[model samples]
Target: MWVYRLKGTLEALDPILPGLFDGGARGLWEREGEVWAFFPAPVDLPYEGVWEEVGDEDWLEAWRRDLKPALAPPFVVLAPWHTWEGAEIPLVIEPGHHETTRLALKALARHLRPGDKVLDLGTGSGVLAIAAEKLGGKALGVDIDPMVLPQAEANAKRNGVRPRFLEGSLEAALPFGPFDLLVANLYAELHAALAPRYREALVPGGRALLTGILKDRAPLVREAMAGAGFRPLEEAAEGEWVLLAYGR
Candidate 1:
């Protein structure tokens, strides 16, 4: 796949933004007050003003080589193949991780007590579930993606933890719950839809760590969680992403 960068300020780029590049913009981030855009395929310049084609490279290599150790204070996440530097917290991971995993792990670390039973919804790579187990908690992770099960299991084995990982959606996740803690790094809409299920899966006075929410849309999920009898306990943000913790 082709890779390219487009440079413009966020102020200048917003006026012409009609969601036209949504399909093509594979990943994006800001640097030095400039909006740097990444595209997988060639796209015509959306802004008619000052812009330059930064250059191009193999998109797959760009993503594959984008690995860095993620530090969430008490935890450091890295792929098994990466060399380890000294870290403050426990190291938890195997490979192909996500930013939300770091954020969710941070939130879970703050509240996880010894012997806590944790259920992780949308357990991609089983990072949080494994982290919870490493924190001296028992964990079970459920993911809708069948493809992630083996990866999750291997990650658990590699990390010397034994968190059970299952394959299924929320309907499948609830059956093994009624746990002391529940953590989900899911999108806002899914969080809203499953808030009640999350509430039901927890023991009374239990906690829920909800993440994978954008800063602007967090209120929607917060409202839904509140309606489901969850009161906000803690909240944290990393860039545009927000994580909310609540008590039932």
Candidate 2:
């Protein structure tokens, strides 16, 4: 097997993916700070990247073997093979350990009140929703992808939590509104645009935890949120990413 490795993220390499697939890529995989395209044999490609030849299954098996559990106080994210000793909440998930996820999870743990109704928008793997339910809040995970909802539900069951997972974006989720807390791990522009709608989806004094925002794009969020009548309470950042906390 042959591999084309590039120093880029999945999102960063989005445009080049179609070209790779057309170039006869057999499979694609994402690793920390990189993207890998697999092929049966080396071929000419316009992109500048390194290439390697490995036995079938070696790339994937080694990746899983090198995985480690993520320890974020109040919760520990793990793959199926990892083990840990502690009283912290255990969440069995793959690729659930990320700076953005970590930043949002830590913030979610701090502001969430017991028994609060929670909405986790763009709940990719339902990590936030599962954690919300684990922390004693009623949670509903919503995503745009219909297929993603099933995986999130599976993840919730794996963690022994029962958060509802739904297929839809914010608009499709408003009917289940007036939650005590709303968490959206979406981009900055989307957050700004949805600030007012976020208020409507929550009860009075409800909190909104917005993550997946780049540092430079935060001011737009701040201005829009304030204009929408949300009061800034706190913020957390990791590298060039940030999470904003607000009260409606």
Candidate 3:
């Protein structure tokens, strides 16, 4: 196995990601202020980086071995290869992995209700949608990127629950909506711009759980939601991110 070690955080190294994946990197890891991409064999690359060789066991198997479980009580995210005993709901998924889904998952645990109609916008790996279903809501997860839809669908299957996964954004979902509840893990500005339509997508008295807002820009969303006549029901923050909940 081979590893290409780059000197930056994964997000800071975003531009190199396309080239790395195109070069056939099987996995990526970030630790100790560096990003590592694992390949089956050394390949000539355009980027200036360090390369080293290791045994197969130290590649795929070891990557999964080093992965840790993510907890959002009432739910615990895990890899399918992982076997853990927890009273919380086990959300088996890819190990890139589940932390990005935690804050929104926490909100779902708080407000989702049995038989509620749900819309998970920017659903990514379909984590929240599946969780909504597990929490007894009928769910439809939509994303602007068509490529992620397959993985999201596969993830739903892996968890032995079937939630509808679709391609396209909120507009494509509106027709089927007027949902009982909606959860979106998109950035602040997008949430603010979509606030008016968010109410249009939900039934009267519907709930909306919006996350992915940065600390400083949270007011933009709160103002937008309020102007849309969404009453604030919950507010949560962790680090620089915030989750705002409201009812139409």
Candidate 4:
């Protein structure tokens, strides 16, 4: 569930790993000819586990290409909610949200129209917003954290897609959108709280993808959406988190 990886100059890791795992290891190994570290993937992790130094391109690909889906490991989720590969990004994501975000985007993509105006709520690292842009939607991303704003914009540029990044909480600085599509990946309470605003943000037939709710809390989310006149189209869950899809 958790692995505390230490970056050492090859030599130190050799003697340290096997002994470290002796205490309690499900399965342990090294990253080959590089940094040596110990992993604790076997243990069950918490609902929201924090993984460090995981934004590197190669490391991310290894997870996407290798670990995910193969193991179908319940605990690993990709954070920061972006779609990226073969590129360097400065944003940090929770291990779980990373993959979940990508899948959310792919599902969200089904409803995209080339010129549709879209909004990405809580665009932590610009993954969904950028993906919308890449898929030909005119997308805007909003986040309360200014620290990640520049990095979000940079990621868009790095991916050869330019999406607008707005600062402020979703309720605060929204450009009076009659949006065609909306994407929100936030905690369940926040999602439900913002439900009315989301409905107000939509134009006729507008759709949304809501992620970050525990599977059990989905009914509340559906109720919120229905209150706003949105119809549920589909839902997905990874670990305890669920991704719900709706159409207006």
What lDDT tens digits, residue by residue, belong to model 1 across residues 1-248? 33333356667667544453564665555544655555655566645323334444444544546777767667877767666667555564654245676678778888889999999888888888888898899999998889999989998998898998888876786677779999988889889988898888989999999989998899899899999999999988878888999998
Clashes of each: 1, 0, 0, 12
Tens-place lDDT per residue, model 4, 202-237, is 887889889878877888888888887788988777
What lDDT does the true structure give each of the candidates?
0.78, 0.89, 0.88, 0.67
Candidate 3 per-residue C-alpha lDDT over 67-137 given as tens digits, one digit per residue, 9 for 90 to 100: 88777877888887888787989888875233436778888978888999999999888899999989988
Clashes of 3: 0
State the lDDT at 51 in candidate 4: 39
**What is the Cα root-mean-square deviation between model 1 and the actual structure?**
11.5
Off by over 4 Å in 4: 1-99
Against the hidden reference, what TM-scores do the models get?
0.71, 0.77, 0.76, 0.63
**What lDDT does candidate 1 reach at residue 167?**
88
Q: Locate the minimum summed-lDDT window of 10 residues in model 3.
A: 94-103
Candidate 2 least-lDDT 10 residues: 90-99
The C-alpha RMSD of each candidate to the native structure, in angstroms, is: 11.5, 11.0, 10.8, 10.2
Which stretches in model 3 have alpha-carbon errors above 4 Å? 1-61, 96-100
